[PDB]
Design an enzyme around this catalytic site. Structure first.
Site, PDB file in Angstrom:
ATOM      1  CG  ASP A  69     -16.982  26.063 -48.019  1.00  0.00           C
ATOM      2  OD1 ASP A  69     -17.806  25.915 -48.965  1.00  0.00           O
ATOM      3  OD2 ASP A  69     -17.307  26.006 -46.820  1.00  0.00           O
ATOM      4  CB  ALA A  87     -21.832  15.789 -58.790  1.00  0.00           C
ATOM      5  N   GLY A 130     -17.591  16.822 -55.283  1.00  0.00           N
ATOM      6  CA  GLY A 130     -17.969  16.807 -56.681  1.00  0.00           C
ATOM      7  C   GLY A 130     -18.577  18.132 -57.081  1.00  0.00           C
ATOM      8  CG  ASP A 172     -24.453  17.036 -48.316  1.00  0.00           C
ATOM      9  OD1 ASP A 172     -23.772  17.755 -47.556  1.00  0.00           O
ATOM     10  OD2 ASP A 172     -25.539  17.416 -48.790  1.00  0.00           O
ATOM     11  CE1 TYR A 228     -23.590  30.733 -58.375  1.00  0.00           C
ATOM     12  CE2 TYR A 228     -25.325  30.247 -56.789  1.00  0.00           C
ATOM     13  CZ  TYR A 228     -24.199  29.851 -57.497  1.00  0.00           C
ATOM     14  OH  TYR A 228     -23.707  28.559 -57.298  1.00  0.00           O
ATOM     15  CB  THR A 263     -27.510  15.667 -51.352  1.00  0.00           C
ATOM     16  OG1 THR A 263     -26.824  16.880 -51.049  1.00  0.00           O
ATOM     17  CG2 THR A 263     -28.581  15.456 -50.313  1.00  0.00           C
ATOM     18  CD  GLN A 280     -16.278  31.152 -50.082  1.00  0.00           C
ATOM     19  OE1 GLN A 280     -16.123  29.975 -49.766  1.00  0.00           O
ATOM     20  NE2 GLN A 280     -17.010  31.520 -51.126  1.00  0.00           N
TER      21      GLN A 280
END
Ligand SMILES: Nc1ncnc2c1ncn2[C@H]1C[C@H](O)[C@@H](COP(=O)(O)OP(=O)(O)O)O1
Ligand SMILES: Nc1ncnc2c1ncn2[C@H]1C[C@H](O)[C@@H](COP(=O)(O)O)O1
Lengths: 213, 221
Positions: free
Chosen positions: A89, A16, A12, A83, A48, A19, A59
């Protein structure tokens, strides 16, 4: 007889609640749960700030973590609720390529590596996708207030949403997929109870006309 | 610019003589997959086994596990999906009825299942199981029509043991992977059976949408 153990993954959009569902579903089933705590991702802050520079190395770093997690799951000799799945990825990588934040050459390098890796990674018996909108994801990001996520625009979450839906249509050819709408109106405990019940329903033998039980 | 989604592995299951290889071949043809199977003649233990199940049962299980292992290495090396005419789980079904009948010791059975468990990570695990449902009586009749000499002494009771053990196996394995159980009734050929199996597989693999909190956000292609 040691029938193969049950592996369940949640997918998700960002925020979302994967977890929370994993913990509650793991409780319902009697399984250990497995997380990847965000604080442990030493690339995420830089990513970010500059996705193009840090995307590919993150990655690889994340793939190393998924490899350790499988060795841990295999060593346990029990079932597991995760989770996050290994496929997610790859979802992120495809949108980064689309956005020009990953080169096509690096993407191919990444997927060759993933393909080489997969034999020793976790492949779920069952995928649970939390269906939320990009706008809901953005709001859950704002409520959580992770500083490194404060810059994510809606367009990025829309790309991610679009890629997830393409991925689900393909992955469902191989493994059972339950896509469950959750806007946080009902509780996470009710959510897990319904997921469990829907899993049991989908696991019934299909009889095609018998003589059985 | 795609992604190596995992490969699809389908196994056929069913009693002796149920026609699993032909169903496997026709299903693979319909799906565009290769098919893999083990000719019975390659089992250099089977003729001694049927003369003396107790002496040759355990070594044959080990021997057959070697075959399942080589077959998985071949499937992995191919980089493609596969239909196989037998799943790795069925050898253990035979081993359990041999123990029940006193043809294999509890200790040898434990040795075998330990070996299987150490092996399992390098063996083929199906994404989808197709069980050909035939009764012990139908199996015995198919055995006679085929007339394998080593099988001529198989009594009905042995096939009833097998049938019961299969039904137990199907209950457990269907908790982990999708199972289609299909009867020969009214199908004139494996090709006809295969076409129904394929249609049922596509139906069972649809995404299950659960509008738990509200309407699904969008239909999925
Ligand atoms: N392969 C990847 N590439 C880029 N970002 C990734 C990534 N994997 C995870 N992330 C980012 C996305 C989010 O910022 C964070 C994931 O946390 P999360 O999805 O919100 O879990 P939860 O739903 O339980 O709240 O890490
Ligand atoms: N693991 C094991 N133990 C004992 N006997 C076995 C085993 N596997 C196959 N067989 C026998 C059963 C049949 O005689 C033949 C398969 O025929 P078919 O008609 O293709 O099912 O091989």
């Amino acid at each position: 007889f040691p029938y193969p153990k049950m592996f369940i993954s949640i997918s998700g959009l960002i925020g979302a609640g994967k977890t929370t569902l994993a913990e509650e579903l793991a409780k319902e089933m009697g399984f250990p749960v497995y997380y990847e705590p965000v604080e442990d991702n030493i690339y995420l802050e830089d990513f970010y700030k500059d996705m193009k520079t840090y995307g590919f190395p993150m990655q690889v770093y994340l793939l190393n973590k998924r490899y350790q997690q499988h060795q841990q799951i295999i060593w346990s000799g029990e079932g597991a609720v995760q989770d996050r799945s290994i496929y997610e990825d790859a979802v992120f990588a495809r949108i980064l390529v689309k956005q020009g934040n990953m080169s096509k050459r690096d993407y191919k390098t990444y997927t060759d590596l993933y393909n080489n890796m997969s034999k020793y990674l976790t492949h779920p018996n069952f995928l649970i996708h939390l269906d939320v909108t990009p706008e809901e994801s953005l709001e859950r990001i704002k409520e959580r207030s992770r500083n490194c996520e404060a810059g994510i625009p809606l367009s990025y979450l829309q790309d991610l949403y679009d890629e997830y839906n393409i991925f689900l249509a393909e992955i469902s050819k191989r493994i059972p997929v339950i896509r469950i709408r959750w806007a946080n109106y009902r509780s996470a405990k009710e959510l897990a109870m319904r997921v469990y019940a829907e899993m049991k329903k989908h696991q019934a033998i299909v009889d095609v006309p018998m003589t059985a039980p």
